[PDB]
């Protein structure tokens, strides 16, 4: 059914095995392009555009409608990362760098203003709140034998 000659092979060195690789993966030779031969083990597997499945046409009649895949067509090396449950590469209304700048500026501005409001706190024009019995020395767990230093409040 699927013979040995139908499997992925090593990187194609000469343009006749490159065309054979294109034929094996059901592509045009001018569309087939392997990953660079850099010792990472890609072999002759075609390097398809790094486009998520969410970018595929949803109104087309795919053999696999959920994955937006057609039978027999070459599968991207990163299919299980670009499925619609996962990393999306879809074009956005605002460009990526501008979004990064706006989000990062918002977060940085918020953090800085929180620090500023920490060193410039808001409070009411009142003296400290007063409690009896030496600021509740016993009630707060003070040692009942050692006598606390008296904390005396005054009728102003």
């Amino acid at each position: 059914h699927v013979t040995k000659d139908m499997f992925p092979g090593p990187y194609p060195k000469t343009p006749e095995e490159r065309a054979a690789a294109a034929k094996k993966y059901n592509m045009r030779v001018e569309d087939y392009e392997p990953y660079p031969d850099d010792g990472m083990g890609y072999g002759d597997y075609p390097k398809l555009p790094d486009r998520s499945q969410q970018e595929r046409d949803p109104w087309y009649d795919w053999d696999h409608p959920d994955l937006r895949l057609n039978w027999g067509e070459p599968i991207h090396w990163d299919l299980d990362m670009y499925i619609r449950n996962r990393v999306d590469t879809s074009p956005t209304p605002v460009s990526w760098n501008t979004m990064c700048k706006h989000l990062s500026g918002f977060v940085a501005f918020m953090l800085f203003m929180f620090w500023v409001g920490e060193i410039y706190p808001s409070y009411q024009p009142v003296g400290p709140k007063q409690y009896p019995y030496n600021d509740l020395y016993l009630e707060r767990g003070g040692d009942p034998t050692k006598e606390p230093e008296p904390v005396v409040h005054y009728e102003i």
Partner: protein, 128 residues
């Protein structure tokens, strides 16, 4: 015009913003036709098996088997030790190990120094 949209790896160039969609040569038309023909041949081959009343099982997909083989069994036959692979292997395999060893060893030496001088309080640490 208007402020340009800059494509990125994670927010790509939309088709309607792509200049190649507007400068189409006759050879581009022939390439599109050949792509349609390949796609139609694959679609016909799949639909013939799919609609067969006397087929039971799974329609074996050579693309799927090629994908699963390339990701598992074709990698070491085609790996080479190059400066890139060796640098990356050393950095990602050995780097985190010694980084974490340094972090944990520093933390535990500080803890043990605190314990020796009794500067670490363990008033209610009877479960370890």
């Amino acid at each position: 015009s208007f402020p340009k949209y800059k494509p990125s790896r994670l927010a790509t160039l939309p088709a309607t913003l792509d200049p190649a969609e507007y400068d189409i040569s006759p050879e581009t038309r022939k390439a599109q036709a050949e792509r349609l023909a390949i796609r139609s041949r694959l679609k016909r081959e799949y639909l013939l098996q799919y609609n067969d009343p006397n087929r039971l099982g799974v329609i074996e997909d050579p693309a799927l088997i090629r994908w699963t083989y390339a990701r598992s069994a074709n990698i070491y036959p085609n790996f080479r030790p190059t400066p890139k692979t060796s640098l990356l292997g050393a950095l990602f395999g050995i780097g985190p190990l010694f980084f974490w060893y340094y972090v944990f060893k520093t933390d535990r030496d500080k803890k043990e120094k605190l314990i020796q001088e009794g500067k670490l309080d363990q008033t209610f640490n009877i479960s370890y």
